[PDB]
Amino acid sequence: KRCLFVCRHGERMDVVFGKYWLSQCFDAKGRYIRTNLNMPHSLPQRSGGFRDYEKDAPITVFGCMQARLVGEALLESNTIIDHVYCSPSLRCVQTAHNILKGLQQENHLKIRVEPGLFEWTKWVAGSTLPAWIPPSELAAANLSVDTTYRPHIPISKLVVSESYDTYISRSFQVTKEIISECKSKGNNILIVAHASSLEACTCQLQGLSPQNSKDFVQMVRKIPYLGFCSCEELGETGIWQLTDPPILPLTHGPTGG
Amino acid sequence: KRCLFVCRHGERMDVVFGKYWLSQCFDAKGRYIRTNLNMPHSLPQRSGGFRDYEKDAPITVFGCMQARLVGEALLESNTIIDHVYCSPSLRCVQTAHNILKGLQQENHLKIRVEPGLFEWTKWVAGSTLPAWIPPSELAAANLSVDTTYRPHIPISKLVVSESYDTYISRSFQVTKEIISECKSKGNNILIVAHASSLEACTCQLQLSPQNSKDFVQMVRKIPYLGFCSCEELGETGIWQLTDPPILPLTHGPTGG
Numbered sequence: 001k002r003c004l005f006v007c008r009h010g011e012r013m014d015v016v017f018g019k020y021w022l023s024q025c026f027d028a029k030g031r032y033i034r035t036n037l038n039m040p041h042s043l044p045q046r047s048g049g050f051r052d053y054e055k056d057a058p059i060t061v062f063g064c065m066q067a068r069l070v071g072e073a074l075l076e077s078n079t080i081i082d083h084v085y086c087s088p089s090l091r092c093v094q095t096a097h098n099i100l101k102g103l104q105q106e107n108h109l110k111i112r113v114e115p116g117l118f119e120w121t122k123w124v125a126g127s128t129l130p131a132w133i134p135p136s137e138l139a140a141a142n143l144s145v146d147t148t149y150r151p152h153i154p155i156s157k158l159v160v161s162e163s164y165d166t167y168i169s170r171s172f173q174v175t176k177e178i179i180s181e182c183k184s185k186g187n188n189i190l191i192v193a194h195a196s197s198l199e200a201c202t203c204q205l206q207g208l209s210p211q212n213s214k215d216f217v218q219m220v221r222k223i224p225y226l227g228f229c230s231c232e233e234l235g236e237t238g239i240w241q242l243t244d245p246p247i248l249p250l251t252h253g254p255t256g257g
Numbered sequence: 258k259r260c261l262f263v264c265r266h267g268e269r270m271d272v273v274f275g276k277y278w279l280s281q282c283f284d285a286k287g288r289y290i291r292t293n294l295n296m297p298h299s300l301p302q303r304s305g306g307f308r309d310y311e312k313d314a315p316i317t318v319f320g321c322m323q324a325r326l327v328g329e330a331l332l333e334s335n336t337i338i339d340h341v342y343c344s345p346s347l348r349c350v351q352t353a354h355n356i357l358k359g360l361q362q363e364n365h366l367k368i369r370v371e372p373g374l375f376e377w378t379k380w381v382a383g384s385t386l387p388a389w390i391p392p393s394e395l396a397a398a399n400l401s402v403d404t405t406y407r408p409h410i411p412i413s414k415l416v417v418s419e420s421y422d423t424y425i426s427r428s429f430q431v432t433k434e435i436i437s438e439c440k441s442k443g444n445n446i447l448i449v450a451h452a453s454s455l456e457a458c459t460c461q462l463q464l465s466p467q468n469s470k471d472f473v474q475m476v477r478k479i480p481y482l483g484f485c486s487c488e489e490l491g492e493t494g495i496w497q498l499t500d501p502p503i504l505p506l507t508h509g510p511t512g513g
């Protein structure tokens with residue numbers, strides 16, 4: 001077969017509890033005090049204190065469970081994952097790790113943190129990139145990250161508020177580089193990143209021309225949490241095609257009220 | 258203090274997947290075939306076939322997690338639940354069970370199924386009540402129900418398309434009958450019912466029950482596993498609302 005799977009990260013803390021979520025779970029002294037059961041028991045310590053979460057928020061408890069279930073669904077369908085890459089966004093690393101937990105592969109597979117899979121940098125606030133936890137420190141928080149992996153696009157080569165074309169171009173360049181270095185090692189590749197990744201990583205893989213920016217944004221906003229798409233290589237053509245994913249979709253509603 | 262905990266059931270299968278949800282997860286021959294990871298691995302075989310679900314829908318996978326977490330939160334607060342009662346709706350009994358799982362008390366405790374705790378019957382479709390699974394059949398699905406339990410208001414004594422006055426009374430009466438029999442047994446009692454139940458059961462145990470229009474508004478504002486706490490003001494017999502012993506639970510949808 002040989003497949004490439006691209007899925008979106010889990011439910012975001014800064015979506016459910018809004019842009020001022022740190023207000024609701026950190027006190028004056030900076031102690032994490034959860035005020036909701038959807039908040040995790042504890043948050044990992046960061047190199048810049050809790051304010052590094054403002055532009056790089058973690059997934060919720062239900063975000064972990066979405067990720068666990070997709071992993072459990074891959075195992076149940078005997079869908080073997082040989083390689084896993086993720087965006088350097090904390091929400092993506094956490095999703096990837098929780099998929100490995102559901103996959104029962106926490107202690108075998110080591111996640112390849114690729115900054116080239118970070119979403120369109122136009123969607124970052126201010127004139128500074130997020131303070132992404134380095135692989136070495138993600139590993140030191142139990143998250144099953146490969147600290148050996150050489151990134152195709154380092155953090156230093158990412159542009160602040162890049163053009164649509166810059167984002168689409170690097171998304172394509174990095175996906176071919178990912179595919180190229182996994183030609184030898186294994187069949188199936190899982191990418192855990194953003195809504196934008198599912199289209200930007202696959203669009204030009206099929207030989208097709210990319211969408212215009214406004215069509216792209218509309219496609220991207222219809223992709224749910226842990227939204228999962230699939231690409232099979234057509235023979236040895238080098239072109240890949242989208243296919244019915246190996247697992248069922250995942251749809252739940254809100255808490256309500 | 259001596260507490261009464263009233264909480265709504267978990268996420269409904271028939272809300273997420275619509276009114277035609279049996280169309281999506283049952284084929285010609287009545288074989289359950291899930292089409293989404295939020296649908297459970299399997300559904301219990303029902304007395305009168307699969308069509309009995311049409312009016313008594315089960316909670317989703319994420320429905321069970323909502324319940325589990327509420328249960329786990331009760332455990333962590335050092336809150337010992339001494340007696341647990343619930344509506345005869347499958348969603349309510351499934352919620353009740355997953356709270357006991359969350360409490361690590363599936364074996365120790367047994368759920369008291371009370372038809373008197375069922376929601377306002379005006380919200381029933383057709384001219385017939387839902388074909389509820391009897392406490393005997395529920396315990397045969399590994400759901401930790403108390404087959405012993407003598408219901409204060411049995412099914413046969415429930416009126417189809419009842420009035421707002423009849424509901425608040427039967428909700429008030431059953432709550433007192435629940436408080437009465439527990440007096441000695443333990444301290445804290447847990448009701449597991451519907452969005453209506455949280456108001457109807459603790460309104461006049463504290464006040465004049467609100468009008469029908471004001472009620473419906475308050476009900477639709479209560480989330481899945483929404484949780485309120487009442488405590489007896491001494492031995493006076495007048496109970497009052499209090500900041501619950503556990504945090505609330507808020508999550509968004511799948512989206513798109």
Ligand SMILES: O=C(N[C@@H](Cc1cc(=O)[nH]c2ccccc12)C(=O)O)c1ccc(Cl)cc1
Nearest residue numbers: 014015018019123124194195196217220221
């Ligand atoms: O929903 C957010 N992000 C999106 C990407 C995204 C980001 C953006 O700025 N504008 C957009 C417009 C159209 C489409 C997508 C975007 C994602 O998760 O895929 C999001 C971002 C910040 C916070 Cl505090 C909370 C939530």
